[PDB]
């Protein structure tokens, strides 16, 4: 009954930014997770609520795949019960998560001499994000008691900042691609 494109959600030509993470629905296939096992230069591979070795002997109604790109030292924030900039204002995982998180380095593909300014993350926001929520707004952020009136200046800042990836950076500041698999009550081989 066909095999869902686990390859295309793992070797896409370009990934999305963390504040605009890309969601793909996977259903009605014979999920052969051998692709995950065969390629293991994985910086992080952690499954919550299910064992990694049992993925082929269990089924769900549908599977969700979320793809984005972050920096290395923020990879630890993609986990339930974790707090931080990315966890609060960019991407939040519920405390009762039942999926897997995969993250691997992409220095060759995403870094560039002089900086890559196509990857953006949200810096200023007023409240924590609800689990599985995305905010793609670009409205000016008010930091004082005077209305911004849609201009940039003191106490009025643009909410997004670019990572600016370049090869001469440290290990922790290099780009890492992250794919999150969410399962809820697709079958294995």
């Amino acid at each position, epitope marked *: 009954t066909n095999l869902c494109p686990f390859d295309e959600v793992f070797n896409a030509t370009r990934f999305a930014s963390v504040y605009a993470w890309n969601r793909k629905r996977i259903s009605n296939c014979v999920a052969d997770y051998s692709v995950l096992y065969n390629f293991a230069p994985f910086f992080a591979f952690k499954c919550y*609520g299910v*064992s*990694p070795t049992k993925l082929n002997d269990l089924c769900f109604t549908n599977v969700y795949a979320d793809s984005f790109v972050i920096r290395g030292n923020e990879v630890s924030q993609i986990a339930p019960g974790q707090t931080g900039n990315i966890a609060d204002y960019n991407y939040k995982l519920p405390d009762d998560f039942t999926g897997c998180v995969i993250a691997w380095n992409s220095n060759k593909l995403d870094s560039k001499v002089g900086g890559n300014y196509n990857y953006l993350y949200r810096l200023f926001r007023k409240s924590n994000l609800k689990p599985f929520e995305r905010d793609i707004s670009t409205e000016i952020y008010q930091a004082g008691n005077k209305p911004c009136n849609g201009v940039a200046g003191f106490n009025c800042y643009f909410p997004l900042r670019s990572y600016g990836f370049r090869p001469t950076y440290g290990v922790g500041h290099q780009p890492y691609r992250v794919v999150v698999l969410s399962f809820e009550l697709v079958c294995g081989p």
Partner: antibody
Amino acid sequence: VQLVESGGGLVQPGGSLRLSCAASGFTFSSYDMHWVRQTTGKGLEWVSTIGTAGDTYYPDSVKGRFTISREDAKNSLYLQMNSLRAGDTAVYYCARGDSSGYYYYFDYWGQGTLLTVSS
Amino acid sequence: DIEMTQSPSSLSAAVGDRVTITCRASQSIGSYLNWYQQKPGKAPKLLIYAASSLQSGVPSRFSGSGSGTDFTLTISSLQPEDFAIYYCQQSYVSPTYTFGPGTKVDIKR
């Protein structure tokens, strides 16, 4: 269900040693295997895990140094240490994993072998 | 890594009494917890899985309760073979399973 360990001994620092675990009383290829170590001051700690589909998983303090393999024909589990440090002395157990619904648990354990490393 | 703790470190109870040992987790792990028993110089044995289910082949006097970040192991009637060390293990975060320090159940004089 019987699990028996062998290969425990004394190795100088920087050595490389192979420990074997043999199993009987159940089908070997339909279950996952784990290697767990116990020290006298840090309690129990998980060091290796191998599954049915030839996938090997390791923690941070073990990546690269140790390797795991299994031979289903002889019902044998092999774990190889390289670049041993003096802090790895412990009693080692080979365990069999199982799952009820979604919950994982080690249901049978082996006798365990002692490993001490020093000058 | 999820940090697991237990209390009390050492407990002494006579034969026939009821005993409770508490295990606490640093995160909400739901019902993903197991309870293990080990005798001196022996391989550990599994007592409880899923934080409430009792392994087949284990005496019914053992029981487990709790959820979230607090769990408790209870023995209704202590017997001489219950002199052992008990551990709590978390099965939420994989594959890095984490155990606990353990508690020793002694006899009282």
